[PDB]
Amino acid sequence: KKLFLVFWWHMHQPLYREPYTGEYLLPWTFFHAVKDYYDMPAYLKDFEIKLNFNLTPVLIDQIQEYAQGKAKDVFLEAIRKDPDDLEKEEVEKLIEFTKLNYEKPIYRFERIRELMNKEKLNREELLDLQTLNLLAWCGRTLRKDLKDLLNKGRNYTQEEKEYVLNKYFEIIKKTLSIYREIKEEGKGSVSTSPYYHPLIPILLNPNCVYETTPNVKIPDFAVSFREDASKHVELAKEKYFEIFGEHPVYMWPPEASVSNEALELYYEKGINMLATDEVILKNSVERASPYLRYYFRELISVFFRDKTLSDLIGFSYHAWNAEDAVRDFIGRLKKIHESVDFQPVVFVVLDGENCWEYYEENGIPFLEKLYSTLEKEEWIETLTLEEAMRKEDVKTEVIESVKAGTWFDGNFLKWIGNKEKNEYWKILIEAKKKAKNDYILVAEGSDWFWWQGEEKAPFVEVFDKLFRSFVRRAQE
Ligand SMILES: OC[C@H]1O[C@H](O[C@H]2[C@H](O)[C@@H](O)[C@@H](O[C@H]3[C@H](O)[C@@H](O)[C@@H](O)O[C@@H]3CO)O[C@@H]2CO)[C@H](O)[C@@H](O)[C@@H]1O
């Protein structure tokens, strides 16, 4: 009797490319590309387990633009320049970026502490600040390759910075290829999401928020977004086909968000399986285990993620010693294994790139220990999404209705409901009446609403500039 374990790492960035200038106004796609988007599937070269990935199409577009050398990334320009060529504003942006990231474990360089405690920085000090900002985001692969430059910790030259930059772009250029490789070799399945990561249930029916939060205030949705909901899914199928040569049959619904209408749309668009959150299951069925494969109306397969296990990795284990965390995770799997006489399917689904910066050494000790341990546990079998979809020796249940929600509290309050978020929806509703191109789809991304107030929102003014620029561009 096995326990089936299914990792599904979700990779996404909203579009940071300002549509009038073409400038990438934040570097987060670059930094997560060099730190996480190649390195997470690259573990499959070293560990004989299965790991699955979601790539949003908008993320794929940006990875391609960086790989082609076309991304005009303003922060990265300030890193690349000789410090004698830095504008005053670029020095300020470099220091502010450092300050925002200063307390993260991946920024724990003695030299960063020295530089941030100095009233003025000279050219050699600025070179160190530029190069250490780059190296703080070094991924697993290059942390071995560049180990000697990493252990320097200071006294970097322009030549060394450019060498690091060159290696980083090498990583980006081979990133889509590694997803094709691990997919073709059967080491993982790759899914995608509706194109710009929108909240499909709200686009289909804004009143679905009242299935969970009767007291929420929403704006007057005086225009239909239902056709846009279909377009996000259709365009995503085509982008996926461009990369992989096939239409996707698995999708990750953004924010785990489902509704009866959203599930019908995914079925109509040929999606065979998705996953969502355990809280949705609890809200929808009186008594139901997340270790079964579910069939929504016999139309589409649904797995409900194990929220506890997923949140332990995504939010808890950065605060743990790595060996202890792996022992805790395996011991929880052992308890699940011993708790049922059938073979449970355990979905661990979470963002694939956001938790690691808070772990010791970027989560590399934790993941290496976790994966090394898993590959040797005879009673655990990790599965691709395809294997999980088709596994016969598993328990199964038909479900007829879900209560609309997300993986954040089972409801939509992170994206709608307060004055500031509602103002964004009002702006979008009015723009949609006048919309002339697909930039309206960009503005439907969940990210813009996530950050709109909110007191914890790094660079929130940039997200606001982007959202409003996409809204304006959509009407021209
Ligand atoms: O400056 C704020 C913030 O920006 C960047 O965060 C991005 C994440 O890295 C990226 O994965 C994505 O995050 C969303 C997840 O995909 C999604 O599943 C859910 O968890 O919501 C997230 C927010 O929408 O997008 C955000 C930006 O929207 C940057 O990496 C952070 O360090 C930085 O704090």
Compute, in angstroms, the gap from residue 13 CA to the centroid of ligand 1: 6
Q: How far is CA 205 from CA 1, 4, 160, 320, in A?
A: 43, 35, 54, 42
Closest-lying ligand 1 atom to the alpha carbon of residue 352: 11
> How many Cα neighbours within 13 Å face the side chain of 475?
12
Q: Cα separation of 415 and 453, whole Å?
A: 10
Q: Whose CA is nearest to atom 29 of ligand 1?
A: 28
Q: Whose CA is nearest to atom 5 of ligand 1?
A: 28
| Paired sense of beta strands 23-24 and 72-73, if any | parallel
Q: Whose CA is nearest to atom 28 of ligand 1?
A: 447
Q: Cα separation of 362 and 107, whole Å?
A: 10
Q: Retrieve residue 143's tokens.
A: 């942390």
Instruction: From 297, 315, 365, select the one nearest 43 (Cα to Cα).
Output: 365
Which residues have C-beta within 8 Å of that of residue 428, sequence separation ≥ 6? 440, 443, 444, 471
Instruction: From 299, 328, 287, select the one nearest 311 (Cα to Cα).
Output: 328
Q: Whose CA is nearest to atom 23 of ligand 1?
A: 447
Q: Whose CA is nearest to atom 33 of ligand 1?
A: 458
With vertex at residue 474, the alpha carbon angle to CA 472 and CA 476, rounded to the nearest 5 degrees, is: 80
381 bridge partner residues: 4
Pocket of ligand 1 (CB under 6 A): 10, 12-14, 28, 32, 351, 353-354, 446-447, 450, 458-459
Compute, in angstroms, the gap from residue 354 CA to the centroid of ligand 1: 7
Compute, in angstroms, the gap from residue 451 CA to the centroid of ligand 1: 9
Q: Cα separation of 348 and 11, whole Å?
A: 14
As a dihedral over the C-alpha atoms of residue 357, residue 362, residue 365, residue 368, rounded to 10 degrees, the angle is 100
Closest-lying ligand 1 atom to the alpha carbon of residue 448: 28
SS3 (DSSP) at 342 = coil
* Identity of the residue numbered 36: D
Peptide bond into 114 cis (omega under 30): no
Method used to determine the 3D structure: X-ray
Q: Cα separation of 164 and 138, whole Å?
A: 9
Q: Is 16 exposed, middle or buried (0-12, 13-18, 19+ CB in 10 A)?
A: buried
* Identity of the residue numbered 412: F
Q: Where are the alpha helices (DSSP H) in 297-418?
A: 307-311, 322-339, 364-376, 385-390
Helix, strand and coil content of the chain, in percent to the nearest 5, comes to 55, 10, 35
Closest-lying ligand 1 atom to the alpha carbon of residue 353: 11
**C-beta of residue 130 within 8 angstroms of C-beta of residue 90:** no
**C-beta of residue 30 within 8 angstroms of C-beta of residue 71:** yes
Compute, in angstroms, the gap from residue 353 CA to the centroid of ligand 1: 9
Compute, in angstroms, the gap from residue 29 CA to the centroid of ligand 1: 10
SS3 (DSSP) at 248 = coil
**C-beta of residue 124 within 8 angstroms of C-beta of residue 155:** yes
Q: Where are the alpha helices (DSSP H) in 340-436?
A: 364-376, 385-390, 419-433
Could you identify the residue written with the tokens 């938790």?
355
Q: Retrieve residue 383's tokens.
A: 């599965």
Give 168-220 as a DSSP string.
Answer: HHHHHHTHHHHHHHHHHTTS--EEB-STT-B-HHHHH-GGGGGGT-TT-----
Q: What is the largest CA-CA distance in the chain?
A: 68
Q: Cα separation of 65 and 53, whole Å?
A: 20
Closest-lying ligand 1 atom to the alpha carbon of residue 460: 1
DSSP state of 4: E
Q: Whose CA is nearest to atom 3 of ligand 1?
A: 458
Compute, in angstroms, the gap from residue 250 CA to the centroid of ligand 1: 22
Which residues have C-beta within 8 Å of that of residue 168, sequence separation ≥ 6? 30, 34, 134, 142
Q: Is 170 exposed, middle or buried (0-12, 13-18, 19+ CB in 10 A)?
A: middle
- The residue to mutate among 318, 351, 421, having the most atoms of ligand 1 within 8 angstroms of its beta carbon, is 351
